[PDB]
Predict the structure of Tyrosine-protein phosphatase non-receptor type 1.
Amino acid sequence: EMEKEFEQIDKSGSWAAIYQDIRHEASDFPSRVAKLPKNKNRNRYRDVSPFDHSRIKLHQEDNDYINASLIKMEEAQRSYILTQGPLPNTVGHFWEMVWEQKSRGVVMLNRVMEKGSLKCAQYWPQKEEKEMIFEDTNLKLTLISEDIKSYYTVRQLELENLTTQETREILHFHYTTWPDFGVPESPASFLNFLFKVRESGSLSPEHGPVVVHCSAGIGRSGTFCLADTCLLLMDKRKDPSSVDIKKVLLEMRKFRMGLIQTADQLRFSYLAVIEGAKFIM
Ligand SMILES: O=C(O)c1csc(-c2cccs2)n1
Ligand SMILES: O=C(O)c1csc(-c2cccs2)n1
């Protein structure tokens, strides 16, 4: 059982050591499309690239590239698109991907500004009456409603395909209280947030995959998917205690590099799953 494994790594302070074994064991696949010169300004970080085998392709004939990966968790029947915080030049691409993949929900785990730097473009409207048009991708985006709470904000946006006049409801779930440094002290507000995303239907197989991002789409984004998948596997399996976080993380790392950036994020992931299991058991 992971609870016992937690006290062991904690009492022994072996987190950096566990983390390094995961680093060592992690898959490595070509990312040739990311590294093409024409795609240099579509990447926020030069060392964070989608693998070619799992990358999302835009349906635009010119350049099909976006820094986004499909994570398919076969046993849990869960898919996620992990992407970087959009750049000023990729906000159009980001909404094209949401449209093309039939995503219901966008999960945002960062603030637009952290540590006095811009971590993300402002890719959604701030007021009902001031909609955004993405001329490059022929999409219009309108803020319908905004529900601001202590730890997160839920926004009801509407996506309109200007080419076809189809419109769709998109839910934007914005976790606003992740600290600039380290991880939250308690996973309570993060779990509440995750249950709120689940309750919306945004993670359900009726819909395209949820889009999850932070700045790079590997650290906080990783913790989100890892906690969701692990909790679902504990509901699905005959023996809940057969669920090994480390194995789940390594399976997710076949789809996108670097998921969980620090030994602190790994410890927090354990804590979130252990705590979440009490509500589930
Ligand atoms: O920083 C930017 O360039 C930016 C953020 S949102 C946005 C646009 C929405 C619609 C057309 S451009 N641009
Ligand atoms: O009554 C509502 O809640 C309402 C009025 S317009 C609207 C939406 C449009 C597009 C997505 S949600 N909802």
In short: The CA atoms of residues 73 and 188 lie 25 Å apart. Residues 1-281 form one domain.
